[PDB]
């Protein structure tokens, strides 16, 4: 079952960039290398951390190229697919295998608002294009499109679809989310979490991957975090995601993703900043990110 | 001439951009699209708003639609064109390419995937604004964006020499007074305060709106033309006499989104073979008649 391939702790990196969105493939290279080395599960790139919408098809092809060329099918790489059309979905997806990832993850993407059915139809297309499974990402607050419990059901029937990244339910209700979709989903179906300040109650509460913004950064601290949710060691667990707090904090006030290129800037991972509109903290909100990073090192 | 404030005013109508499965625009259907606006008289002619699938085509098949429009019009009415991009870089250079392609005005959308900050959006707008020296209205569909603009923002953006108008949400509660009573004072001094929503927008002008971006007009520009003027002259009777033969399209529109139903009803037409670009689908069987059933209603 090609869910296997989405389970554990998925790392999400970014895609250094200049201000015309050339793709800095040296710097990209240095954090695949150091997400390799440190063993992750997968890496997903081109997600919303790797700023995927910003980047134009030819240069989405060239990260996923040298992405594949050094992970050399010996870790899981999985590729960012959406696009507003369908037909620019499917040549990416067709793209992404081409060029050599293992998977797709693929977010309803829209400007008008689809239907649940349009949704569906969608899936089906991008998803029969290729011969690589499909997670489905599902994030309201990038896509603007909610999935119906019933659309979830019909769309983890589609044959190459055995995956799906959640989105925290307001709840926190981790336990109650899953004991009401693994049911009515497909048997097997890998159901995760991304929103990483909730991701190790998730886990512990019987989550099946991480989609993580920290660790495409970080992995060694979120790799150690990720096992002991893994186990189901909530003592260990709950300390380890305590010494956290810190950038969770950050992330919810600011959003991952800005918050991320700061820590990266930081660590000399990256001279590059978020594609605009987007724009990059202050002076003293980069030294909190400062202050976070040295609670983890 | 003095203020490029009323070049916005009046009924703006939009139509679709016919394009094949690939997102070639069909131009031929688009040309005759066009110069039924300028011969019906609307006030300006709305190109690549959201009606137009402005998002789901290339900038060279954008641009070659603002090409077409301008070779139709020569000039003779208002030509409007959308230039949205997630990137400021790719929204600058739309911009640009507008007015090289002989557009008189620009619209310009919050388009998002992250979402951004109220600052960030000023600088957005600001960016595209500096690109050009055309006038540029501020396109508040936040259906198509979840991005409100605070009032505060509102007032950061009406104050770019430039952008001189804004399309409106219909207000939720639907007063149309209430809200213009409180945003004309703040916004800078005869900023034009126009609306969309076919179904609200004959209330919207009665109640002091200075814009119909109609969507209803960029395919029937006689009949809409007709009832945003008797809305205009302040004939309110009239005005909702009219409104009331388009209601059928109107429930409609709010049932299942105007960009499907109006799609139908050009097909119905004649004036378009093309359909909503994929993944939007078209109407079903059932929905099309009712559509037919509509236009004639209206007719
Ligand atoms: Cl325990």
Not at 22 to 43: K, M
Request: some cysteine; proline content about 6%; aromatic content about 8%.
């Amino acid at each position: 079952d090609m869910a296997t391939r989405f389970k554990g702790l998925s790392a999400f990196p970014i895609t250094p960039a200049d201000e015309a969105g050339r793709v800095d493939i040296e710097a990209f290279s240095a954090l695949i290398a150091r997400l390799d080395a440190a063993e992750v599960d997968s890496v997903g790139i081109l997600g919303s951390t790797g700023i995927y919408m910003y980047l134009t098809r030819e240069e989405r092809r060239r990260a996923i190229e040298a992405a594949a060329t050094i992970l050399r099918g010996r870790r899981t790489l999985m590729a960012g697919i959406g696009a507003l059309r369908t037909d620019e979905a499917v040549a990416l997806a067709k793209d992404a295998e081409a060029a050599g990832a293992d998977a797709l993850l693929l977010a309803p993407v829209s400007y008008t608002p689809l239907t649940q059915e349009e949704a569906y139809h969608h899936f089906a297309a991008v998803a029969g294009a290729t011969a690589l499974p499909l997670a489905i990402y599902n994030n309201p607050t990038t896509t603007r499109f909610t999935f119906s419990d019933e659309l979830l059901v019909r769309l983890a029937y589609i044959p190459n679809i055995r995956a799906i990244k959640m989105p925290l339910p307001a709840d926190a209700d981790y336990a109650g989310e899953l004991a009401r979709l693994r049911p009515k989903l497909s048997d097997d179906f890998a159901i995760g979490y991304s929103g990483d300040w909730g991701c190790t109650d998730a886990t512990l509460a019987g989550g099946d991957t991480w989609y993580s913004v920290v660790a495409g950064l970080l992995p060694v601290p979120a790799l150690q975090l990720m096992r002991a949710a893994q186990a189901g060691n909530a003592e260990e667990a709950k300390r380890l995601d305590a010494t956290f707090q810190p950038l969770w904090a950050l992330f919810k006030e600011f959003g991952s993703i800005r918050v991320i290129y700061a820590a990266a800037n930081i660590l000399s991972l990256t001279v590059s900043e978020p594609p605009r509109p987007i724009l990059p903290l202050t002076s003293a909100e980069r030294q909190r990110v400062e202050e976070a990073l040295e609670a983890l090192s």
